[PDB]
Design a protein around this ligand. Structure first.
Ligand SMILES: CO[C@H]1C[C@@H]2CC[C@@H](C)[C@@](O)(O2)C(=O)C(=O)N2CCCC[C@H]2C(=O)O[C@H]([C@H](C)C[C@@H]2CC[C@@H](O)[C@H](OC)C2)CC(=O)[C@H](C)/C=C(\C)[C@@H](O)[C@@H](OC)C(=O)[C@H](C)C[C@H](C)/C=C/C=C/C=C/1C
Length: 116
């Protein structure tokens, strides 16, 4: 796989998402030099899902390839760090209009909040 995952806080080890499911996630993304280019983790309130965690369906290509594959190995509660090679993120061109330089390897802390 072209990502690397380190478990930072262990999940419940029972509830894992399948390719069907909708996952609810908090995240922070940093570029190589350390600058966080995006987070949804909030210092005003979490409360109550204000603001709301990210939601998408796993395994169906709604998100970048690194996220899609890594979410399938996480259990509910798990906070993990993910280093994703450019090939499994925004690749050669990157996404300039969204702060992603060309050929950036990207590091994300991700936390699985809930699965339905
Ligand atoms: C302001 O914050 C943005 C998130 C930003 C966008 C730009 C990137 C730098 C970034 O900074 O986040 C970022 O941190 C990032 O790289 N992320 C977001 C967190 C998950 C991983 C990654 C990502 O894959 O983003 C995604 C990346 C940008 C796009 C994918 C790239 C690969 C390709 O396979 C996919 O095609 C399907 C599109 C953005 C998302 O996580 C959102 C949730 C999903 C989509 C937009 C698409 O799946 C779309 O499909 C048409 C949908 O079905 C959605 C649900 C439809 C509804 C109406 C739109 C919601 C839009 C929400 C946008 C949000 C909260």
């Amino acid at each position: 796989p072209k990502y690397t995952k380190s478990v930072l806080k262990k999940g419940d080890k029972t509830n894992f998402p399948k390719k069907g499911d909708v996952v609810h996630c908090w995240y922070t993304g940093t570029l190589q030099d350390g600058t966080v280019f995006d987070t949804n983790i909030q210092t005003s309130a979490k409360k109550k899902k204000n603001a709301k965690p990210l939601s998408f369906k796993v395994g169906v290509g709604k998100v970048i390839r690194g996220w899609d594959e890594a979410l399938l190995t996480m259990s509910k509660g798990e906070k993990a760090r993910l280093e994703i090679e450019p090939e499994w993120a925004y690749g050669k061109k990157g996404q300039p209009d969204a702060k992603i330089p060309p050929n950036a390897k990207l590091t994300f802390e991700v936390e699985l909040v809930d699965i339905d």
